[PDB]
Design a protein around this ligand. Structure first.
Ligand SMILES: Nc1ncnc2c1ncn2[C@@H]1O[C@H](CO)[C@@H](O)[C@H]1O
Ligand SMILES: Nc1ncnc2c1ncn2[C@@H]1O[C@H](CO)[C@@H](O)[C@H]1O
Ligand SMILES: Nc1ncnc2c1ncn2[C@@H]1O[C@H](CO)[C@@H](O)[C@H]1O
Ligand SMILES: Nc1ncnc2c1ncn2[C@@H]1O[C@H](CO)[C@@H](O)[C@H]1O
Ligand SMILES: Nc1ncnc2c1ncn2[C@@H]1O[C@H](CO)[C@@H](O)[C@H]1O
Ligand SMILES: Nc1ncnc2c1ncn2[C@@H]1O[C@H](CO)[C@@H](O)[C@H]1O
Lengths: 221, 220, 221, 220, 221, 220
């Protein structure tokens, strides 16, 4: 495809989607066997390997709705991928969400215009695939992780002049801020494939755990 | 409160929210014991009774975001309600959603402006309380119902000049159309209380209904 | 129709539209003769009777644009209704509007998205039928009521976090807040039929009279 | 004021507002006595004279919301004007509206952003002063004119790539298109003064004009 | 055309566009020879004359996007005009822009809805014709003027309740406020013709020079 | 900074901003001397070296408004960068724009919400720094390149369901589509620093690239 140089058939139907291509490399090296690197276009590393007997891929997405949209569109439309699990980080809005918590996004709010353009006059709520969500939730519960299932903000702007609306979203139970989920969920829905975002809380607005999170994402995917 | 004539303490912390006040009456009569009617203001019947030893209420909401918003605000702010489960109907958008399926809304899209006003420049995605959602899903699964968990459209307009965008939403996996969930989920989130919508597919764009009420009561 | 169980021909061409179905019952019982109840679907009572020799109906609408839109669409499209007069309550924004004043809405502002969806990029101003408006105004004047003709806000939200914009609308002469008029006026205009809203001021944001208001609405309709 | 060179007190409390400054000249010459021209800034002629014993002014506004907004703001805030009646032309959308009909705008739709900026998230419906509207309607009726009271479109764009939405507005009873009323009505409402627009249908998408000026003067 | 009474062929392919029709008269009288007045419809004076051997026209536009849009549409579509240079005034937002500075607008921000209607969901940035811009910039530089090339605000509202957003735009380098440029640039782009706005700073939000500015606009056009 | 591991002073005041970090590497290797790599966080390579006696940096931005916004904010606010020149690719909308043409963006349209959030109710037109634009234009002209100065679309979506609006923008003279300029120009304006985007037409909806880098370095 335009941004992925990997053949037909080189990418597995199940794929993990870290924002950071170097985390894709870390995931492939740490968890996968029989690994090949299928992409280095724009340094956006993608790998395919085997995890407990199943082929799985792991592909960097870059940061932000537009970047992940490129890779997700190409993965689905050009490579026939069917299960896509973002594995990322996020920033907690509120005090009850703690660093190293694992957040599974049921849905995502956004300041992106991507869905207003597609559905003028409507608020589109991007939804996780429930089957994948349940699978990841159960795996995370079994793993002994602090797993929170809920709402996140998919932000276009990492640096905001005022965090007032972010705080307000926190008051309406939005757990954390990140920069990809709206796109992943919307595009997965568009193409009738299955998506989920599993996030580690790395900071506040106001690794051993990461490995466990990758494990539950691998298990789900 | 303005639209509910109940005395303090007469409404249970767990409440079912049918759109139709006559369905509230049906639910109270069919499933509850030790029933009292606590509201007849605007004919919007509300009841409290006991289900398997727990006090539970059931309150009509009327149709549409503005109507349910009134009742949900009053229930939360004036009556200290904590768990709110809409029990409603919806119209399937897609072929794979069948009449009498039970839909549990994870989230809701909307053509309402309610959230654009509150969060200018943002798309707010109203989210179900996951704990309640899981509880209802597990109950419905155990019950042997066809339960679908997914996205719904909360519509302001029942009669649309064109259903092009509704069809498009169906193409993006939106399961069905109804007229309340956005408001219920948003206001519950605002006040830090727990909400869920459990819906019977009644049309396309009863025995089933009883089983759905049962799982809503159980989750509630 | 979907929400009205009344036959063909059971609903009169002129109809009053209280938000409260129990007010429909009150109106039918108090003012009409030869009354039949043609609807109890969802408890949304509708009646037809005779007032000074003319058949007239009275139908609850419920609260809010979406609720009244349902009934108005069905009344016009399924029952051939031609003159629709909402008879409601409203909350005064400003000090110069007094409790028990009768407001006749020339037009309505709104926070609803209903018209932005229909006319993207435009502000649609829903307008009363002038003939009905004049008729009601003259009847109210003759009756000795305090009648104010002007602008109202049709609100989606009864409970607002901040009343700042409502106050601002009051500063621009918007008289009162209610929750139906935009829909009634827009749909009446769509179908080329005649609508009006006559409102009693019941509260501030910051019965003998009701009967007189029903009388002028009956006279107009 | 910035765009009007009149001294304090030179402008009457009642004023007619044609879009065309040459029509202001025509109105002053044709109908008024004891006339003075109080403004020629930007050629936007303004006059004050006497009509049946009352001082009245007549001021060109130019075309479009931004142009009329300038003059109306200055007239209200700098000159203490209280009654403002636009006397203009418009283009009929619908077949049932005929050339030379007089339209009295009860309200106006618009494609302008002026009110979305002031009231974010709201549709503001600019409303005529009912007292003035009734006065003009009664005068026009008495005059034997075809007078239509209803909705108009205040357009930012005279030349539109597609008139689909204009046609749609006509389907919702919008009578005619013009380019000022939204601004006049909104600003009059802002400042608690009285405004009306009385329009002659000149096209579809004089003797009549004189009679319309007469009813505007009478209402004014 | 509807608003211009001048024949076919009476208007030159190059035209200056002052907002004030009396400035059109001043420009024609002061700079042009062999002058004819081709329009007095609505007092919106338009002239054609000769400047250094070339026919050029000068046409008032009135104030505001809607007014200039009328004249620009008619000039392009009915009279085949190809080079359009607005010559106007503007109000400086910020302290570093001085009275009597000449501003050449590269682009314009706006509170107008004109472009949101044309390109729903998009921000359209109206752009000057670079060739004309360069020509005017070089002429202004040669003339010894203080010429600033940059961004302006095309306002619908001259009188704003709050100047907060205008100040904010000034903080983002927007130089001055005026009321025509968005329309001129957008319509010129629509029809594939060449436009520029050259503005004299006449005021702050918070003639010898004018003649020199007209001279550079004449030279460019 | 959060996404750049450079020590204070390691990044030059003048910087080139390719979307592709591997192009940053190519630029540093091909054109610069005394090169150090100051960043590998997220593989988003950044280098500083010397070009004709001046320190200059080159930093990958990634694709899309949100990605470039992160880097540009950090470069300006944490590293005191003053002159920022995006060196990118774009897709021609129109027939008259040819592959390998160099486009210098005077401004950018966008489907991003970034500026609607900052300036509600306004269309913000992000503008290049004219001084830099002129410098690059003159360099490109001198170089014998086909240089077009004009409007571009900064897109959030590379893959669009319909390219109708993109075609329409091309009809209004928008030259090409790319995915960063709106952000770069807006943030540079916010912080009072100087930005420009110089783009190679790579597709429709190298030797050329080297010459373009050269003019960007010269302007920088
Ligand atoms: N506080 C935060 N705000 C926005 N994105 C964040 C935050 N913390 C982590 N992220 C994630 O990391 C990247 C931005 O640093 C994005 O891909 C985003 O998903
Ligand atoms: N097809 C449908 N469209 C909209 N609402 C529906 C539909 N079917 C059932 N409903 C539900 O029933 C009521 C409208 O008839 C609303 O309360 C709504 O939730
Ligand atoms: N203050 C108020 N705000 C909104 N709606 C009101 C108010 N007072 C009366 N109403 C009317 O009564 C109902 C809400 O109580 C709606 O149908 C509405 O029209
Ligand atoms: N068809 C029309 N479209 C828009 N404005 C019109 C029309 N006919 C007359 N007008 C009025 O005349 C001027 C535009 O020619 C404006 O002041 C406007 O109010
Ligand atoms: N401060 C200002 N605000 C808006 N427009 C201005 C200003 N100064 C001059 N103008 C220009 O002059 C007219 C408004 O007085 C408009 O045509 C506009 O372009
Ligand atoms: N046709 C195109 N559409 C969008 N972006 C493009 C195109 N061609 C090149 N680009 C640029 O390349 C990247 C997307 O491939 C973005 O960084 C963008 O600026």
């Amino acid at each position: 495809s335009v941004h992925i140089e990997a053949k037909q058939g080189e990418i597995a139907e199940s794929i993990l989607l870290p924002g950071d291509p170097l985390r894709a490399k870390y995931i492939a090296e740490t968890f996968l066997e029989d690994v090949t690197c299928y992409n280095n276009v724009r340094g956006m590393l993608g790998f395919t390997g085997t995890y407990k007997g199943k082929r799985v891929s792991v592909q960097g997405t870059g940061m932000g709705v537009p970047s992940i949209s490129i890779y997700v569109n190409e993965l689905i439309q050009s490579y026939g991928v069917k299960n896509l699990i973002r594995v990322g980080t996020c920033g907690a809005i509120q005090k009850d969400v703690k660093v190293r918590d694992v957040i599974i996004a049921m849905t995502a709010c956004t300041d992106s215009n991507m869905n207003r353009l597609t559905f003028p006059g409507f608020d589109f709520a991007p939804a996780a695939n429930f089957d994948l969500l349940k699978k990841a939730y159960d795996a995370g519960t079994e793993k002994g992780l602090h797993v929170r299932v809920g709402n996140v903000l998919t932000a276009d702007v990492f640096y905001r002049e005022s965090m007032d609306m972010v705080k307000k979203l926190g008051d309406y139970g939005v757990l954390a801020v990140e920069m990809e989920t709206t796109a992943l969920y919307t595009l997965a829905a568009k193409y009738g494939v299955n998506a989920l975002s599993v996030l580690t809380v790395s900071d506040h607005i106001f690794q051993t755990t990461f490995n466990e999170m990758i494990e539950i994402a691998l298990d789900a995917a």
